[PDB]
Amino acid sequence: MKIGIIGAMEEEVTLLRDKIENRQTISLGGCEIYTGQLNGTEVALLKSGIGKVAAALGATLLLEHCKPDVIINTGSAGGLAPTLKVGDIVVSDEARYHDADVTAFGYEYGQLPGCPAGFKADDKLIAAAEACIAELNLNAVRGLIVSGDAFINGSVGLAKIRHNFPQAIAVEMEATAIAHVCHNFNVPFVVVRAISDVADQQSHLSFDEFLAVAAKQSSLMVESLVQKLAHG
Amino acid sequence: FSMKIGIIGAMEEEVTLLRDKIENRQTISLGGCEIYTGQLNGTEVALLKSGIGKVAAALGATLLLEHCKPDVIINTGSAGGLAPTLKVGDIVVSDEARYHDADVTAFGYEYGQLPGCPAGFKADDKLIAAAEACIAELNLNAVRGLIVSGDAFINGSVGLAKIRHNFPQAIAVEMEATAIAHVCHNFNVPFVVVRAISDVADQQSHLSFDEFLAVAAKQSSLMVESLVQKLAHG
Ligand SMILES: Nc1ncnc2c(CN3C[C@H](CSCc4ccccc4)[C@@H](O)C3)c[nH]c12
């Protein structure tokens, strides 16, 4: 069993990179993949870069060169669910683009042609993440995570997300692109991210202040998740 | 006699004319995409049908580069016209490509720019020069300039007005070119976009698109055919 892990930023993957033993680095298409073992479990950790295209490019390389069994997308997120606080965990049951619009041709808002309207996260991965959450006494929410190529900062951008996706629990920039690539290769995925901000007019300040905490929380969750998946 | 020209279009109607002209055609099926290998009037080509939108294009482009290692990439297909002098059927050639829907301006990046990327991706001078030569030789109407991409079909209202405000110099809008440019940038692969106008991205864009996609696909395909020939044999 080989678990794939994707994070956008150095800050989001560095704690995990530090823990990978028998570590090698694949440098390709402007991405880095760190292979080896995380607490005795085979992993391949991609630092993708920010945004949908970076993520898609990276995920494609990871799948092709490492052939992981499953994909875990980690990192920070803007919280949208009312009970989320900075540091809290969000688990995808599903990922959708909040910025895709071909509704003029009768696709669902956020759906692109040739894709499902949303991408369903894997039930077994979700169950394992929720067990870890319980064992670690974490505050978490499970639900729709929406992705776009914009940093959300209140105002019109937030209003548009609330309009189209009142049920969305968090917003970020890579998860759906990762889900989309996984869909095309029939690879199970889950998103396990931690809240850095709440996507409002204070989101820039909050993010600067709480990215470190979000990166730590998400990484600790991912470590626990990898362990649970490999060793029950 | 040793070059391989990569060509990318999103939709079947955009690649079908080119696909039909491929000698010794074969098909590679991978990651939900198709790549047609063979020769086009004697020049080795690899033609990708990527599907629609930024991720589809990125996934497709990555596979094409990894599996086929083309020397250059030509992005073909339709676009919404933004430049005044553009009519349906006319050619657009990219000088450069920017995301019209990327916004990390909150952290001081230029509008359209993603962190880790240049603010826009420049098309290859030689590729552009040859595209401009084919335009003269074919006696076509064309504009060269900035082409912008996003994951939305543009249909007037705020959608169009926002693009025109943020990119007053943009000459066309579509949904794959910048994703392709971005992937090519990361692999150090020269690209050019050579598309043809199907609509003017206004209230009427959906009707205009349905009506003039065939014309767009024809005119773009003709241009790519001449371009491949020019790149291969001067
Ligand atoms: N409010 C928000 N909107 C969109 N995404 C997020 C995220 C998740 N991220 C965090 C990452 C950074 S956003 C742009 C950026 C670039 C350089 C420095 C700081 C921030 C990007 O990979 C997506 C947290 N809060 C968000």
Ligand SMILES: Nc1ncnc2c(CN3C[C@H](CSCc4ccccc4)[C@@H](O)C3)c[nH]c12
């Ligand atoms: N007004 C416009 N906005 C964005 N893109 C375009 C384009 C270029 N295309 C044409 C392609 C189709 S747009 C979405 C779509 C979906 C199903 C059926 C028809 C069109 C997509 O690859 C981007 C032409 N006019 C456009």
